[PDB]
Amino acid sequence: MQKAVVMDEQAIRRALTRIAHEIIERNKGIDGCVLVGIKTRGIYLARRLAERIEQIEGASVPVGELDITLYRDDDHEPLVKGTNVPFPVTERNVILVDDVLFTGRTVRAAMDAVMDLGRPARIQLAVLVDRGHRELPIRADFVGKNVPTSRSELIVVELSEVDGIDQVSIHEK
Amino acid sequence: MQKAVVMDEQAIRRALTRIAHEIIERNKGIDGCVLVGIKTRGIYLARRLAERIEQIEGASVPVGELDITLYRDDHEPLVKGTNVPFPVTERNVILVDDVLFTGRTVRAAMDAVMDLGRPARIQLAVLVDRGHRELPIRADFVGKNVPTSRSELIVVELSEVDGIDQVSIHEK
Amino acid sequence: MQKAVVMDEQAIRRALTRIAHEIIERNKGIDGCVLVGIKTRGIYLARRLAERIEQIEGASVPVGELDITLYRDDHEPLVKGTNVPFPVTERNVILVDDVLFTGRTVRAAMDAVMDLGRPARIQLAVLVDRGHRELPIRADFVGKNVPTSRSELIVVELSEVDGIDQVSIHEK
Amino acid sequence: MQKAVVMDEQAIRRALTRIAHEIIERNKGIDGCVLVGIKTRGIYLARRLAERIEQIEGASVPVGELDITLYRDDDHEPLVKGTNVPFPVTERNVILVDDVLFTGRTVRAAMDAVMDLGRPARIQLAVLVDRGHRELPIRADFVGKNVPTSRSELIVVELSEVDGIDQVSIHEK
Ligand SMILES: O=c1ccn([C@@H]2O[C@H](COP(=O)(O)O)[C@@H](O)[C@H]2O)c(=O)[nH]1
Ligand SMILES: O=c1ccn([C@@H]2O[C@H](COP(=O)(O)O)[C@@H](O)[C@H]2O)c(=O)[nH]1
Ligand SMILES: O=c1ccn([C@@H]2O[C@H](COP(=O)(O)O)[C@@H](O)[C@H]2O)c(=O)[nH]1
Ligand SMILES: O=c1ccn([C@@H]2O[C@H](COP(=O)(O)O)[C@@H](O)[C@H]2O)c(=O)[nH]1
With beta carbons under 8 A apart, name residues in chain A contacting D88: none
With beta carbons under 8 A apart, name residues in chain C contacting D17: 21
DSSP string, chain A: -EEEEEE-HHHHHHHHHHHHHHHHHHHTSSTTEEEEEEHHHHHHHHHHHHHHHHHHHSS---EEEEEEEEEE---EEEEEEEEE--S--TTSEEEEEEEEESSSHHHHHHHHHHHHH---SEEEEEEEEE----SSSB--SEEEEE----TT-EEEEE-HHHHSS-EEEEE--
CA–CA gap between residue D45 and residue C23 (Å, rounded): 22
Min Cα separation C141/chain D (Å): 13
What separation in Å is there between the alpha carbon of B140 and the centre of ligand 2?
17
Torsion of CA A89, A94, A100, A103, to 10 degrees: 80
Q: Does C120 touch chain B (CB under 8 A)?
A: yes
Please tell us whether the domain made up of C1-172 is placed in CATH 3.40.1550.10.
no
Atom of ligand 1 nearest to the CA of A103: 14
Q: Could you tell me if D45 and D159 are in contact, meaning their C-beta atoms sit under 8 angstroms apart?
A: yes
- B119: helix, coil or strand? coil
CA–CA gap between residue C172 and residue B6 (Å, rounded): 50
Q: Could you tell me if D139 and D36 are in contact, meaning their C-beta atoms sit under 8 angstroms apart?
A: no
What are phi and psi for residue C151, nearest 5 degrees?
A: -80, -15
Q: Could you tell me if A168 and A147 are in contact, meaning their C-beta atoms sit under 8 angstroms apart?
A: yes
Print burial letters for D19-32: b (CB count within 10 Å at least 16), e (below 16).
bbbbbbbeeeebee
What are phi and psi for residue D112, nearest 5 degrees?
A: -65, -40
Q: Could you tell me if B166 and B147 are in contact, meaning their C-beta atoms sit under 8 angstroms apart?
A: no
Q: Which of C86, C112, C108, C111 is nearest to C34 (CA)?
A: C86
Based on C-alpha coordinates, what's the Rg of chain A?
A: 16
CA D113 to each of CA A99, A119, C49, D67, D79: distance values in angstroms, whole numbers, following the listed order:
27, 19, 41, 11, 9
CA B164 to each of CA B168, C94, D127: distance values in angstroms, whole numbers, following the listed order:
12, 41, 41
Helix (H) / strand (E) element for B91: namely none
Q: Does A24 touch chain B (CB under 8 A)?
A: yes
In sequence order, the 6+-apart residues with CB closer than 8 A to the CB of C107 are B110, B114, C77, C135, C137
DSSP string, chain D: -EEEEEE-HHHHHHHHHHHHHHHHHHHTSSTTEEEEEEHHHHHHHHHHHHHHHHHHHSS---EEEEEEEEEE---EEEEEEEEE--S--TTSEEEEEEEEESSSHHHHHHHHHHHHH---SEEEEEEEEE----SSSB--SEEEEE----TT-EEEEE-HHHHSS-EEEEE--
Compare all CA atoms of chain D with the CA of C143 and give the residue at the minimum distance: D25
Q: Could you tell me if A159 and A45 are in contact, meaning their C-beta atoms sit under 8 angstroms apart?
A: yes
- B11: helix, coil or strand? helix
Residue ranges of domains in chain C? 1-172
CB contact under 8 Å between B136 and C110, yes or no, is yes
- B169: helix, coil or strand? strand
Chain-centroid distance, C-alpha D5: 20
What separation in Å is there between the alpha carbon of A13 and the centre of ligand 3?
34
- Using CA positions, which residue lies closest to atom 14 of ligand 3? C102
How many alpha carbons lie under 13 Å from residue B116 in its C-beta half-sphere? Answer: 26
Q: Could you tell me if A96 and A36 are in contact, meaning their C-beta atoms sit under 8 angstroms apart?
A: yes
Q: Does C105 touch chain B (CB under 8 A)?
A: no
Helix (H) / strand (E) element for B158: namely none
Based on C-alpha coordinates, what's the Rg of chain C?
A: 15
What separation in Å is there between the alpha carbon of B130 and the centre of ligand 2?
9
Q: What is the resolution of this structure in A?
A: 1.7
Q: Which of A25, A24, A82 is nearest to A53 (CA)?
A: A24
Put simply, the chain D residues between 44 and 73 with a CB less than 8 A from any chain A CB are none
Amino acid letter at A19? Answer: I
Q: Could you tell me if D166 and D9 are in contact, meaning their C-beta atoms sit under 8 angstroms apart?
A: yes
- The partner residue sitting opposite A15, judged by closest CB among B15, B18, B25, is B25
CA–CA gap between residue C163 and residue D7 (Å, rounded): 43
3-class secondary structure for A111-124? Answer: HHHHHHHCCCCEEE
Query: CB neighbours (10 Å) of residue C56?
Result: 16
CA–CA gap between residue B66 and residue B79 (Å, rounded): 7
Q: Which ligand is nearest to the CA of B68?
A: 2
Q: Does C24 touch chain D (CB under 8 A)?
A: yes
Amino acid letter at C121? Answer: R
What separation in Å is there between the alpha carbon of B96 and the centre of ligand 3?
27
CA–CA gap between residue D46 and residue D95 (Å, rounded): 9
What are phi and psi for residue C48, nearest 5 degrees?
A: -65, -45
With beta carbons under 8 A apart, name residues in chain A contacting B10: 28
Amino acid letter at A67? Answer: D
Vertex A113 angle, CA A108 and A118, to 5°: 130
Length in residues, chain B: 172
What separation in Å is there between the alpha carbon of B163 and the centre of ligand 2?
20
Atom of ligand 3 nearest to the CA of C77: 12
Based on C-alpha coordinates, what's the Rg of chain B?
A: 15
D100 marked ligand binding residue:
yes
CB contact under 8 Å between C122 and B111, yes or no, is no
CB contact under 8 Å between B21 and A14, yes or no, is yes
- B42: helix, coil or strand? helix
Min Cα separation D73/chain C (Å): 42
| Backbone conformation region of residue B146, classed left if phi is above 0, alpha if psi is from -120 to 50, else beta | beta
Provide long-range contacts, Cβ within 8 A and 24+ apart, for B77-81.
B77/B104, B77/B105, B77/B107, B77/B108, B78/B108, B79/B108, B79/B109, B79/B112
- B117: helix, coil or strand? coil
Q: Does A138 touch chain B (CB under 8 A)?
A: no
- Using CA positions, which residue lies closest to atom 17 of ligand 3? C99
Helix (H) / strand (E) element for B137: namely none
Helix (H) / strand (E) element for B171: namely strand B166-171
CB contact under 8 Å between B28 and A17, yes or no, is no
Q: Which of A25, A57, A146 to mutate to test the interface with B (most CBs of B within 10 A)?
A: A25
3-class secondary structure for chain C? Answer: CEEEEEECHHHHHHHHHHHHHHHHHHCCCCCCEEEEEEHHHHHHHHHHHHHHHHHHHCCCCCEEEEEEEEEECCEEEEEEEEECCCCCCCCEEEEEEEEECCCHHHHHHHHHHHCCCCCCEEEEEEEEECCCCCCCECCCEEEEECCCCCCEEEEEECHHHHCCCEEEEEEC
CA–CA gap between residue C107 and residue A15 (Å, rounded): 31
Helix (H) / strand (E) element for B149: namely none
- Which chains neighbour C (Cβ–Cβ under 8 Å, 3 or more pairs)? B, D
Q: Could you tell me if A76 and A58 are in contact, meaning their C-beta atoms sit under 8 angstroms apart?
A: no
Chain-centroid distance, C-alpha B46: 7
Vertex B146 angle, CA B133 and A98, to 5°: 105
Which class in CATH covers the domain with range D1-173?
alpha beta
CB contact under 8 Å between A137 and D141, yes or no, is yes
What separation in Å is there between the alpha carbon of B101 and the centre of ligand 2?
5
CA–CA gap between residue A11 and residue B26 (Å, rounded): 9
CA A4 to each of CA A11, A44, A103, A148, C149: distance values in angstroms, whole numbers, following the listed order:
14, 23, 22, 12, 12
What are phi and psi for residue A118, nearest 5 degrees?
A: 170, -155
CA–CA gap between residue D36 and residue B169 (Å, rounded): 40
What are phi and psi for residue B21, nearest 5 degrees?
A: -60, -45
End-to-end CA distance of chain C: 6
With beta carbons under 8 A apart, name residues in chain D contacting C25: 11, 14-15, 18
CB contact under 8 Å between A123 and D137, yes or no, is yes
CA D109 to each of CA A112, D67, D137, D150: distance values in angstroms, whole numbers, following the listed order:
10, 11, 13, 24
What are phi and psi for residue B50, nearest 5 degrees?
A: -60, -40
CA–CA gap between residue D20 and residue D131 (Å, rounded): 21
Compare all CA atoms of chain D with the CA of A97 and give the residue at the minimum distance: D137
Chain-centroid distance, C-alpha A149: 18
With beta carbons under 8 A apart, name residues in chain C contacting B110: 107, 135-136
